[PDB]
Write a protein that binds this ligand. Sequence first.
Ligand SMILES: N=C(N)NCCC[C@@H](C(=O)O)N1C(=O)CC[C@@H]1C(=O)O
Length: 254
Amino acid sequence: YKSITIATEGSYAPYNFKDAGGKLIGFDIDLGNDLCKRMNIECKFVEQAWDGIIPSLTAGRYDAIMAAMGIQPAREKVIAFSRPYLLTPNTFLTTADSPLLKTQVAIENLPLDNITPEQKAELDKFTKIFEGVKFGVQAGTSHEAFMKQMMPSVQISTYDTIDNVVMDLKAGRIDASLASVSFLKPLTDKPDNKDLKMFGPRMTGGLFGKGVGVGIRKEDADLKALFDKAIDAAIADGTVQKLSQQWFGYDASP
Ligand SMILES: N=C(N)NCCC[C@@H](C(=O)O)N1C(=O)CC[C@@H]1C(=O)O
C-alpha cells in the first residue's frame, strides 16, 4: 500500500465531526493519521453519510472506515474489522429533570452475551419503565438494533444523525435516547448540557459486539494485518490513551 482513503461520518463528536473551517476532526481522524504514519501509508479522510458508509466501502469508493463504528456481529457478515482501538459500554440518556433518573439500577455493568434470568429481569424492568416514554436513536446503529430487538414494546423514532436526536431531546420531542458512554460522557460533561444526564445499566456485548474498530473489506487481509499491527503499537506506547483523554476526557483505550 502507498495511499488509502478512510471514510468517516463527521456527525459524531468527539470521534468525528467538523471544525469551524469545515475540516474533519476528532479522535478517529487523529488516530487514523497516527496509524497511517506507523504503516507508512499516505492518509486522506473523506466525509460519508452513515446510511451508505458500509456499501460505499464494499463498492470500492474508499479503503477503510473510521467512524465510531462498533465491531457489531451483524456488520461482520458484510465487512471485516481491525482489532478494537477503543472500548465502551452503552447506556441511556435523558433530561436532568426526568423522573426516569430516580429509577434504581440493580445491575451497573450489564453484559448481554448470555442473558441470565437476573439480567433479563433488569432489562424487563427498564422496558416496563419505558412504556409511554418516547425514545429517539440514530438510524442504522446498534442502539436502534438494541431497542428493536431487546425493547420492542418501547416507542422508537430513528434519526439521520445523533445531533438531531440530541436537538429533539433538548426540545422535549423525545424523552430519552441510547448511545455509547464514549459519546454520552463528553456530551454530558459539557456545561452546555448540564440539563442532560446518563442513566441506567452500562451495557456490553450481545448485538453490540465488543469495541470500536476500523471497517475494512473482507478480501483486504493484508490491510487488516497492517492496521492490527499499528493499533497494537499505538495502544502499547500510550498513544490511544493520550488521544482518548484529549477527545473524550477519560481513558477508553483497550
Ligand atoms: N454516527 C456514527 N459515526 N457512529 C454511530 C455508532 C453507534 C453505535 C454503532 O456502532 O452502531 N456504537 C456502538 O454500538 C458502540 C460504539 C458506537 C457508539 O455509540 O459510540
